[PDB]
């Protein structure tokens, strides 16, 4: 098991532009294209990504390509996140699994959502730090996609993959 797997399990895999839960323009295994309105916007977005006039269609490879980047990036966010908000040593003290969920939770957060968390994080404390996490996954996925939200916090709160297993 792993973060990849885990996200493929949580995100699902779509090759045709759709709206997510929040009604955004998304694609693949999470690829948020755009928050707008007009598809076009999102389509165009897709186009520069891919670079080939997809017209809302992609391929497994294509998708897999976006994915990896998305992941490496969440993985990167996470660090910076607790980089700030102080509590860096927490980032370091972490283990695989916790940290995987962390990556999950924060993927594919986007500056605005990112910002807040950091706040809610600092303003929390070295020991409290944890609940903002659980807190953020809740809300992001609660109401709408609660199994996911459950799957995460657990994994996060347990350091065990059994949940996704």
Curated annotation (Swiss-Prot):
Its EC number is 3.2.1.17. The active site is at 11 (proton donor/acceptor), 20 (proton donor/acceptor). Changing residue 135 to I: 5-fold decrease in enzymatic activity. Changing residue 30 to A: Almost complete loss of enzymatic activity. Induction: Expressed late in the viral replication. It catalyses: Hydrolysis of (1->4)-beta-linkages between N-acetylmuramic acid and N-acetyl-D-glucosamine residues in a peptidoglycan and between N-acetyl-D-glucosamine residues in chitodextrins. Keywords: Antimicrobial, Bacteriolytic enzyme, Cytolysis, Glycosidase, Host cell lysis by virus, Host cytoplasm, Hydrolase, Viral release from host cell. It is found in: Host cytoplasm. One of its GO terms (molecular function) is lysozyme activity. It holds the Pfam family Phage_lysozyme. PANTHER family: T4-TYPE LYSOZYME 1-RELATED. HAMAP family: ENDOLYSIN_T4 (MF_04110). This is Endolysin.
């Amino acid at each position: 098991m792993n973060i990849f797997e885990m996200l493929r399990i949580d995100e699902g895999l779509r090759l045709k532009i759709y709206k997510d839960t929040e009604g955004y323009y998304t694609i693949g295994i999470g690829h948020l294209l755009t928050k707008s309105p007009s598809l076009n916007a999102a389509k165009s977005e897709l186009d520069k990504a891919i670079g080939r006039n997809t017209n809302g269609v992609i391929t497994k490879d294509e998708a897999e390509k976006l994915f990896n980047q998305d992941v490496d990036a969440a993985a990167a966010a996470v660090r910076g996140i607790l980089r700030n908000a102080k509590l860096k040593p927490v980032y370091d003290s972490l283990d695989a699994v916790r940290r995987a969920a962390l990556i999950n939770m924060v993927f594919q957060m986007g500056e605005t959502g990112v910002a807040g968390f950091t706040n809610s994080l600092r303003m929390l404390q070295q020991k409290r730090w944890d609940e903002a996490a659980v807190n953020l996954a809740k809300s992001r996925w609660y109401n709408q996609t609660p199994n996911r939200a459950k799957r995460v916090i657990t994994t996060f709160r347990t350091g065990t993959w059994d949940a996704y297993k």
